[model samples]
Target: VNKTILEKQSVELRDQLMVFQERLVEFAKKHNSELQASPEFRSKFMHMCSSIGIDPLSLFDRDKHLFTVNDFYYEVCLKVIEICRQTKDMNGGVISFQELEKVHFRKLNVGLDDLEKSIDMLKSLECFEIFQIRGKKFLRSVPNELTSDQTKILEICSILGYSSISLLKANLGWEAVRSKSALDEMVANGLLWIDYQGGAEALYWDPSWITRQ
Candidate 1:
């Protein structure tokens, strides 16, 4: 792809990609596939899609139409299912994710409400940055406190995961790291609870905050 076209289109692309990627990770966890591997997977996956003639990046263009992350994800999943069905001669038969190679899906226009909801669902779905924890299930000690930093971190994490802190540190500066202290304070205040453990980095959430409605 041309860098100029990519650059000009990326603000919207990145925004939509952020939401779409989050939902993908969330679903992967739900199905027990790891998305940490996805940063690289995404570039290659989309590149493959492009080779096949689908421009995954163009899914966020405003002129096409509107959809939600979940909507986009569902469509992608359906397409993957169709591809698998064709491969297996399994039409009108039980579909298996295993039958098909995973396909990347992007919708150019996602509505604000559904986009927000899908992002929230993706955030709620994560256990934190760690090893082997996937989906809604977790080990122990996930943080429940909502510090300003944690809040922002969660917002970004909901969309970006462990890299959220790094982005904040880059854009917002070193002080952002200190939000861990605020997270601790929130923990002390009984507003948050640590849910999973056994990782160098622990994941936490608010005791009062339910992840998905």
Candidate 2:
């Protein structure tokens, strides 16, 4: 197709994507900004958006699909893996995971997992008569700002690796015991890569932000 025709068709597609973008922004804006602002989150998001020919910063301005946030993240993750594999062959070398400690691993893994979740979330968003509604209504009410405790918790995890619930209870003196619920939530959602042997997790991440549908 010529540029003119492609533009015309893209106009219509852009209109459709706008519906998805508006809702996505609304949802992202309501959630923890820290999550949105996290180094892992933003880097992976930008990487995935670039891969899909959509600028992460300009997602609202592009023609796109109504895919779940997690799904998008997963797609990116798979792509990163594929790219890394190719790089290894090209260089006649291999990427090793064993030499990595918590800091670097979290730097590589967390972002990948986060982008996947964001894309997955995007998939369920429905365009309703030019308006979009997806994900749970309750999530809409979540504050974008993280509580002080939440920040402290994540920082501790990032700097010190895993801190047991019992330790959190005793060390981080709080009026109310903050269940490892927040930490657990991040893990369950794939934002935090939980380790098997030592219950260690990190904010580390890599490029596998999203994968194929």
Candidate 3:
């Protein structure tokens, strides 16, 4: 009787474990982006897995190629990082989505739909952010904080799509020296790009600033 009872208990426990595993798999399918992006969600998920004697971190044991889909995303992320590094000299850490889509589609032979979806997944993973400057969108892979002056410049850019020292002087009613100082500092910090139009004045634009114009 004791042996029979022990065998029954083992069968019941196996069934319970299988059910838990199924639920976990379903949750991953439905909420992978949220799971990766939200610390609170991850905490709850970890506790839930602990209740079932499962170590969720074990899934990461496979490294960059966890599953087929995750592997593809990892590949996409690697390519994005590589592209950012390659283009940093010209655009700092910012790169245009159109340019990225073109390169990625040609190199990865993946559809833009898939690439866009993968980019969304990458954003959830804290890989990059989408930003617009002068009506053009770009991806910024690194984190940065805008200074007060920089924020003000972005706000101004939102109105005109770009700003120059003279524009700042006239709009903000500041002295030429003050406007020039601010613009130069912004350029030095990589917050602004200078476009030479074959004239005495150069146009300055903050690529991360999106405006109405």
Clash count, one per candidate: 24, 50, 1
lDDT of 3 by residue, 27-114 (tens): 7556656655444555666577778877555543333432544455567667776777776655556656767776544666544444
RMSD vs true structure, all candidates: 18.5, 17.6, 10.1
How do the residues 36-70 of candidate 1 rate in per-residue lDDT, one tens digit apiece? 22334434444544454544433333323322323
User: Which regions of candidate 3 deviate over 4 angstroms?
Assistant: 1-70, 103-105, 111-113, 123-127, 133-137, 146-162, 169-178, 195-197, 205-213
Query: 2 or 3: which has the higher lDDT?
Result: 3
Off by over 4 Å in 2: 1-147, 174-177, 199-213
Give the per-residue lDDT of model 2 (tens digit) for 24-125.
Answer: 554444443433335565565456555545545445332333233334455444543443345432211222222111222354444433534443343454
Best of the two (1, 3) by lDDT: 3
Q: Any idea how many clashes model 3 has?
A: 1
* Model 2 whole-model lDDT (C-alpha atoms): 0.40
Query: What is candidate 2's CA lDDT for residue 111?
Result: 46
CA lDDT scores, all candidates in order:
0.38, 0.40, 0.63
**How does residue 144 of candidate 2 score in lDDT?**
31
TM-score of each: 0.23, 0.25, 0.48
